[PDB]
């Protein structure tokens with residue numbers, strides 16, 4: 001199997017842990033300690049390649065060595081969306097590159113209180129040249145898609 005090192009970043013409270021816990025446990029957590037920053041492993045077949053996803057769920061070596069970044073905001077949190085820029089500047093600085101495998105994730109899609117429309121998120125991901133994927137860690141909508149798509153963005157950038 002092949003290792004892929006993934007890093008989930010974004011403002012406090014957006015769903016990094018919930019996304020990460022969904023992917024691995026297939027369940028939704030209401031209350032995950034917002035300070036717990038830790039690495040999780042998951043073995044999964046993605047397009048016939050057995051993959052070991054090594055995932056840092058940041059709380060706020062992986063930044064330097066992480067091969068791909070899920071930049072998460074919550075769609076019912078405008079501030080978190082506006083914050084994306086800073087998470088991106090951080091990763092560009094660390095990698096000394098504008099071409100970092102990256103997906104922009106708009107989480108909490110299940111929630112009715114939408115303050116960031118898909119067109120805004122699409123405008124942002126287009127400026128950056130990255131995919132935008134909408135998720136809900138609660139229903140699991142898009143969660144596999146965000147993580148797989150990040151894997152695929154990593155393969156697009158380098159041989160794995």
Ligand SMILES: Nc1nc2c(ncn2[C@@H]2O[C@H](COP(=O)(O)OP(=O)(O)O)[C@@H](O)[C@H]2O)c(=O)[nH]1
Pocket residue numbers: 010011012013014015016017018019029030031032034107108109110111135136137138139
């Ligand atoms: N309804 C809903 N609540 C969510 C979702 N993701 C996270 N939450 C809630 O938002 C709070 C913060 O989640 P935790 O994100 O994982 O925050 P982070 O790890 O600091 O980004 C918790 O109460 C979660 O249950 C989601 O997709 N839908």
Ligand SMILES: [Mg+2]
Pocket residue numbers: 016017018032033034035036058059
């Ligand atoms: Mg957390």
